[PDB]
C-alpha cells in the first residue's frame, strides 16, 4: 500500500494553532518510515490522521493513490492495522477482538498462533474462559500493555497492507518483551509501516527517518545520512 500526505495542514477542534503545517510525506509500498520528535511535535498526529478520527483542514491524504475520504469506512479499517493505545476494542471475546470482529474468516489455530506471537497468550490463559472470555463490559478491562498486545496479535493475524505502529512502552528489557520487538520487526518488514518512534535506538533501520518539530517536518533521511547531516536528528542522538 502507498500512503502520501500532500500539503496537509491540520488543527485539532477548538485549537487556535495548527498541529500540522503543510506536511508532504510519501511512503511507497513496503517501506518503513519512522517519525521522530518531541511528544506533542505532531508525529503522533500524522499517524493518527490515517485512521480518520479527524479530517485534515487542507491538502490531501492519498492511500494507493486515492483520497482517504473516498474510502468507505469498512474498506479503511480493512486496509490499516493500528498498533497503539487507540486500537478499537469490541465488547466481545478476546478471540473476536484479535480477529477484528471477522468471524469464521480465521481459524482457531490462526487466532491462537497470533496471540502467542504477540506474547498475549500468557495473560489470556489466566482468564476464566481463555480466548473466549468476554472483555470490555461485565468482563475484564484490559491493562494498557495487554491492549497493546491484543493490537499486535490483531495486526499479525490480518496481514494488512498498511501498519501504523506506535512503539509505546519504550521501557523494554526482559525475554517476553525482547521478542515483542522481534515480532514487531518481522511485522513491519514486507509492509507499508509508519512507526511512531519513542526511543531513537529502535528506528535506526527504518528506510527513512522523518524529524517533526512543532508540526513541521524539519529533516528526512536514513540514520547514517542524518548523522553526517549534523542537524536536529544528530542532536537528538544525545539520548543514547
Amino acid at each position: 500500500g502507498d500512503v502520501e500526505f500532500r500539503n496537509v495542514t491540520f488543527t485539532y477542534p477548538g485549537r487556535d494553532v495548527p498541529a500540522l503545517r503543510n506536511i508532504n510525506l510519501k511512503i511507497p509500498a513496503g517501506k518503513t518510515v519512522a517519525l521522530v520528535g518531541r511528544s506533542g511535535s505532531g508525529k503522533s498526529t500524522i499517524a493518527s490522521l490515517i485512521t480518520r478520527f479527524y479530517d485534515i483542514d487542507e491538502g490531501e491524504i492519498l492511500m494507493d493513490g486515492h483520497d482517504l475520504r473516498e474510502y468507505t469506512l469498512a474498506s479503511l479499517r480493512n486496509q490499516v492495522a493500528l498498533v497503539s493505545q487507540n486500537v478499537h476494542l469490541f465488547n466481545d471475546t478476546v478471540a473476536n477482538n484479535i480477529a477484528y470482529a471477522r468471524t469464521e474468516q480465521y481459524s482457531r489455530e490462526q487466532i491462537e498462533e497470533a496471540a502467542r506471537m504477540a506474547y498475549a497468550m500468557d495473560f489470556i490463559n489466566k482468564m476464566d474462559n481463555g480466548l473466549d472470555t468476554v472483555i470490555g463490559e461485565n468482563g475484564v478491562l484490559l491493562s494498557g500493555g495487554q491492549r497493546q498486545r491484543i493490537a499486535i496479535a490483531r495486526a499479525l493475524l490480518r496481514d494488512s497492507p498498511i501498519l501504523i505502529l506506535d512503539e509505546a512502552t519504550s521501557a523494554l528489557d526482559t525475554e517476553s518483551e525482547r521478542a515483542i520487538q522481534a515480532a514487531l520487526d518481522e511485522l513491519q518488514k514486507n509492509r507499508t509501516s509508519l512507526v511512531i518512534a519513542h526511543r531513537l535506538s529502535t528506528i535506526e533501520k527504518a528506510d527513512e527517518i522523518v524529524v517533526v518539530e512543532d508540526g513541521v517536518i524539519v529533516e528526512r533521511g536514513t540514520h547514517n545520512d542524518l548523522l553526517e547531516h549534523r542537524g536536529v536528528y544528530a542532536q537528538l542522538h544525545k539520548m543514547q
Partner: nanobody, 113 residues
Framework: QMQLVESGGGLVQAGGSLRLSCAVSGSIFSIITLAWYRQAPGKPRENVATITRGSRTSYADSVKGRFTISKDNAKSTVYLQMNKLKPEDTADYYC????????WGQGTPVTVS
C-alpha cells in the same frame, strides 16, 4: 513546489573567498533545517555545513574555521561564506532543505586553482 536556487559560484585562486547564496521559496524557512553539500567529479555528495531552526550551525571537519553558514528568514535565503579556499574545495555546491532525503538545488560550481 519548493525551489532552491544557488548562486555565487565561480573560479578563485587558492586563499581566495567566495560567498554562496541560495534562495528558498515554498518552505517553512524559519523552522526546517537547511544545509550546504558539495560533490567533486569522482566522489559522492557530502555535507559541508548545516543550520537548524535557531541558527545553530555545524560544519564538516575539513571546513571548520574557514566556512560559515547563515540564514536570513526575511529574505528566505541561506548563505555559505567560504574563506581561505583550498583546491580541495573544488566541487559542485548544493543547497539543501529538510535533510539528505529532502529537497535540493541544482548546484553552483566552485573551482579553486
Amino acid at each position: 513546489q519548493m525551489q532552491l536556487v544557488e548562486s555565487g559560484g565561480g573560479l578563485v585562486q587558492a586563499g581566495g573567498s567566495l560567498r554562496l547564496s541560495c534562495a528558498v521559496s515554498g518552505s517553512i524557512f524559519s523552522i526546517i533545517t537547511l544545509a550546504w553539500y558539495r560533490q567533486a567529479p569522482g566522489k559522492p555528495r557530502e555535507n559541508v555545513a548545516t543550520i537548524t531552526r535557531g541558527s545553530r550551525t555545524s560544519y564538516a571537519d575539513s571546513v571548520k574555521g574557514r566556512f560559515t553558514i547563515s540564514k536570513d528568514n526575511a529574505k528566505s535565503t541561506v548563505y555559505l561564506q567560504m574563506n581561505k579556499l583550498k583546491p580541495e574545495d573544488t566541487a559542485d555546491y548544493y543547497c539543501n532543505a529538510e535533510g539528505p532525503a529532502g529537497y535540493w538545488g541544482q548546484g553552483t560550481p566552485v573551482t579553486v586553482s
